[PDB]
């Protein structure tokens, strides 16, 4: 084409002709500049004063191709650093994009959905500003069809991704009323069968379940948990990862919220998550298990009935370090809230030897956690007089050595608790 590899000054020259077609040629040239793999000259385009011009081409209904090329170019500028996105926002692009959502041309309205994604994705300020200019209704209106399958699927993947950026980020979280407004549509996309729509829906739901409990409540009350759990079942890691993150958020809430996930079947998928060959899934599953072990006795009991304690012993014994840390926490939590039977059982599954092994990590915080894991367990062995039998096993497998040495460690809690234990059970 005659619009390949132009110079910025050419683009300026055409954009300042007063000839709508030359403007179009030069805007298409800018767009192609801005779409190239290595290092598009975003700043020059910005310094040349192009943004107000592009922005005002958005409003030329009479001339749809220029609407589209300007949309795309502005999209790609807005895809840069914050500073580059501020330039696009500062040119007035937001209301002008919101207007293109109504375009009769699907390829143009799709480009506007996409640009607004890049803006909202910068941060909660821009996100909340896209929201204030009215974007949500017309976005939601685009999905108001009896069956999502009839929409082109590039199109649907865009809207979903955009919607999920309106759910994203955190100081502050998105406005409650915006959330209520978006949710029914999330719930529907979360049942659609495109893997990418599903990944992005789960991501939205994870962004919404990362805060305080009223926020989690809003999501739980929509009844998406069963569906999350099924997605947790999914063979595509790009779906499992966000599903697992949303499950994980949700069980940081109340016991009653945690129970919906237990009720939903979640614990049956754990054998497999806790042995997942993706390190990250294994970490997050463990993290999730640790907030389930911080619940009620009868919840700890379900972790027991599902056969998950061996999988924690497993993870304590061999996984990557950060996953072992989370496992330690699952253990300490289990040992605080557990009955005696339960804590006994945990010992019979073989928790002591791999717990001691970790005692020799250079991570000062894991050691504290392990320390009252032991402590809590000693505690329960007192209530059945078994401290002997217990002290022996700890002795038997290198426990006592590392422990005693602990005293000679720089810490307030470390040396206190180690010395304590030794003075209490090993003198």
């Amino acid at each position: 084409q005659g619009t390949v590899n132009w110079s910025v000054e050419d683009i300026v020259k055409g954009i300042n002709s007063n000839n709508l077609e030359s403007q179009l040629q030069a805007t298409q040239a800018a767009r192609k500049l801005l779409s190239r793999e290595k290092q598009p000259p975003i700043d020059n385009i910005i310094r040349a004063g192009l943004i107000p011009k592009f922005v005002s081409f958005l409003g030329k209904t009479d001339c749809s191709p220029i609407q589209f090329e300007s949309a795309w170019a502005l999209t790609n500028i807005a895809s840069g650093t914050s500073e580059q996105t501020k330039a696009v926002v500062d040119g007035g692009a937001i209301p002008a994009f919101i207007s293109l959502l109504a375009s009769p041309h699907a390829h143009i309205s799709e480009q506007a959905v996409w640009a607004l994604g890049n803006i909202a994705g910068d941060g909660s300020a821009f996100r909340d500003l896209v929201i204030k200019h009215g974007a949500i209704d017309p976005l939601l209106a685009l999905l108001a069809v009896p069956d999502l399958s009839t929409l082109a699927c590039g199109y649907l993947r865009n809207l979903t991704w955009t919607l999920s950026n309106l759910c994203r980020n955190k100081n502050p979280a998105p406005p409650l009323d915006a959330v209520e407004q978006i949710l029914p549509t999330l719930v529907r996309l979360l049942h659609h069968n495109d893997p990418e729509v599903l990944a992005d829906s789960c991501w939205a739901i994870s962004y919404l379940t990362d805060g305080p409990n009223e926020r989690i409540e809003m999501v739980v009350k929509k009844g998406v948990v069963p569906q999350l759990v099924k997605l947790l079942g999914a063979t595509e890691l790009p779906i499992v990862t966000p599903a697992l993150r949303a499950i994980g958020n949700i069980v940081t809430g109340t016991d009653e919220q945690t129970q919906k996930v237990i009720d939903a079947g979640a614990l049956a998928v754990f054998p497999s998550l806790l042995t997942n060959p993706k390190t990250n899934i294994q970490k997050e599953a463990t993290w999730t298990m640790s907030n389930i072990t911080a619940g009620r006795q009868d919840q700890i009991q379900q972790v027991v009935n599902h056969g998950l304690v061996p999988f924690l012993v497993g993870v304590l014994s061999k996984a990557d370090f950060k996953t072992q840390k989370e496992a330690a926490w699952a253990i300490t939590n289990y040992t605080s809230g557990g009955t005696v039977e339960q804590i006994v059982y945990l010992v019979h599954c073989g928790i002591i030897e791999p717990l001691m092994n970790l005692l020799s990590a250079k991570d000062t915080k894991i050691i504290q956690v392990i320390l009252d894991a032991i402590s809590n367990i000693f505690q329960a062995a007192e209530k059945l007089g078994e401290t002997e039998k217990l002290s022996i096993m700890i002795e038997e497998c290198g426990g006592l050595d590392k422990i005693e040495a602990l005293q000679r460690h720089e810490n307030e809690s470390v040396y206190k608790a180690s010395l304590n234990l030794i003075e209490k059970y090993f003198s």
């Binding site: 192609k32 801005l34 779409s35 190239r36 793999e37 598009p40 795309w72 999209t75 790609n76 807005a78 895809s79 840069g80 996105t85 480009q111 996409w114 994604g117 890049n118 994705g121 910068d122 991704w161 999920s164 950026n165 994203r168 990944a199 992005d200 991501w203 595509e236 890691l237 790009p238 779906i239 499992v240 990862t241 966000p242």
Partner: peptide
């Protein structure tokens, strides 16, 4: 599987 892009460019 992994994070969702914050921003994306429509590419060549």
């Amino acid at each position: 599987n992994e994070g969702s892009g914050s921003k994306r460019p429509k590419v060549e």
